Design a protein around this nucleic acid. Structure first.
Lengths: 60, 99
RNA sequence: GCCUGCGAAGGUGUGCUGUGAGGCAUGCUGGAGGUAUCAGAAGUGCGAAUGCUGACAUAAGUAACGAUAAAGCGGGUGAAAAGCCCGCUCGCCGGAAGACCAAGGGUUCCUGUCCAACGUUAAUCGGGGCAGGGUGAGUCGACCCUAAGGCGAGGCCGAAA
RNA sequence: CGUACACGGUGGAUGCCCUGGCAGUCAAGGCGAUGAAGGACGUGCUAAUCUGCGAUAAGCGUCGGUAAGGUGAUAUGAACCGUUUAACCGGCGAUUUCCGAAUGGGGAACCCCGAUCAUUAUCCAAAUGAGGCGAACCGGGGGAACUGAAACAUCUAAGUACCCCGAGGAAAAGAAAUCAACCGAGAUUCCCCCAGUAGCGGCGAGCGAACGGGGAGCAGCCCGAGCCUAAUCAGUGUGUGUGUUGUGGAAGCGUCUGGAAAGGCGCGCGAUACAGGGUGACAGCCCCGUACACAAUGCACAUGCUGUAGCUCGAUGAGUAGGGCGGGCCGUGGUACCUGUCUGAAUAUGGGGGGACCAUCCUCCAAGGCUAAAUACUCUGACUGACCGAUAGUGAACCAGUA
């Protein structure tokens, strides 16, 4: 997701997204448990996403 | 200057007459062209110099002095490959003096 | 106004010339630049401050390792074992080299793999090097408060920390 | 074991090179309680350092530039991103946990709140100020000694070192009761000269101006009333001359040596652009760059303009002038300035000054106040230097203000 997408989303959409990404921000945490499908791309990307939307939320 | 997106033509080395594209350019001045390779032990198509030893660099180690890109003079060389989105570079490419 | 990778400056050895201070040449090497004339220039040409700094020789392969003075005989492992491990025998210490702790130090603890470095010998040993693991309390300690005493605020003093 | 040399080693000089220093020059110049500087501690898949950030942590967003290569220095392994055009460069915006001058209070970063002084005050901190930092320069005060006088108590070093308070990017001074060659000059600083003269001094050693002149820079005005409107004040609009990056940018030529020329030799060229660096060995004509060109920002000092708004009349400041006592300081001499105690005028039909006192000329008028402009340093950016070269040069060209 890019800043352009988040700005287009509504106040509720950003909330459901932050929450969806929040719920999303759970699935991962399994490497130390011995996982594989865990991707390093979104590891760092997701934290930025929930943040990007968090920044625009205040910009509004 | 020399770029990686260009084709070179040998003129001195035992690979004289071979054609190919520039693999990569090192800050050493040497240039490895797609073609000038060597036959390793287990016969693996990998460019490298001819000398005994353990671990040594790849590339056949060609020199810009014996190569042939766009030399403004009378030679035996012929056509050579060369960006376009620049626009201004297209004018020079169109001129029989530069590229 | 000249020399140079048909090779210079520098260095080593050597030949020649000058009263000399030096110039110059050859061979080896070096292998990058280096001079002569006239002219100007420089923080300019040096062995002798219990001089300053770094390096080094002779001296020396000379001096030294001493109340808890205990090791020894077999065996095991190992390429090597007089001081790694096993058994036996022989001893040391007992307010003490025993047990539990403060301060302080601080992971140095444990396991595995090694040892180039450390252990005033060697080491397959280690409080050594490398990689992991270990210190799971409401009632333990911190956290809290206070004594001698101290600090900040108001009061009062050219001025003020 | 003496001595020379040979081969090898130890060692590290020397020769060359050097991403560093040293020095000069131009430009530019403040930060913060919207809590900065600095420090602490995090942050990249691995990273121990440095740098960048800081928990959206060597990163996020927008615009513009740019460009295909990119993911800091380390060119590693793994791996990611980029044409839904990144990296990189410039500006700006968003965000920016906790502690932290924070000030609620305590405290070696941890736990609970506008602390203290002060003004206004609806006296409710309700509305505000101060409390910090910063290279030097600047202003107002306090104020030595060793030393020199080849002794030393004046003097000299000092009005320096150091200390206290404070402003700005610039301060202080200043419109003359001055100067005094003159029927004249005429606001004040600063530079040069006048002077090392006048003057001071056990007149010993030493100390040491000013007027004027030649320049730089030039601006004059305000405190009772009358009257009326273009000084001033409040506000509005808002620059010419720019900052960084990218675009318009010619150019391996020949022979020889070599692994390679930025060699030797031969030839040609740039120049309102005759710095330097990079590219496999001394390339101004290989690449960047130098003169040059263009676009993004900051500053936009000024000007214009609205409403205010001229101008006119009189006067002009006493514990002051001055005198006495005791000191400081100055080139200050009975003839500098200032502080402390005491005394104490007149008043423009007046008074002060012209380096002695008192009566007579000339000049000018204090005891109230304000005022632009002309030099400093050098953190920062850039450039330069017949400067030094890594036991040289900044202590630091290698982790250094580190071990």
């Amino acid at each position: 997701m890019k800043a352009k997408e988040l700005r287009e989303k509504s106040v509720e959409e950003l909330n459901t997204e932050l929450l969806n990404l929040l719920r999303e921000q759970f699935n991962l945490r399994m490497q130390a448990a011995s996982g594989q499908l865990q991707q390093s791309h979104l590891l760092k990307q997701v934290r930025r996403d929930v943040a990007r939307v968090k920044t625009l939320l205040n910009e509004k | 200057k020399i770029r990686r997106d260009d084709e070179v033509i040998v003129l001195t080395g035992k690979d004289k007459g071979k054609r190919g594209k520039v693999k990569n350019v090192l800050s050493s001045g040497k240039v490895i062209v797609e073609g000038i390779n060597l036959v390793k032990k287990h016969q693996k198509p990998v460019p490298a110099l001819n000398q005994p030893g353990g671990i040594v660099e790849k590339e056949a180690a060609i020199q810009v002095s014996n190569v042939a890109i766009f030399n403004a003079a009378t030679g035996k060389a012929d056509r050579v490959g060369f960006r376009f989105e620049d626009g201004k570079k297209v004018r020079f490419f169109k001129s029989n003096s530069e590229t």
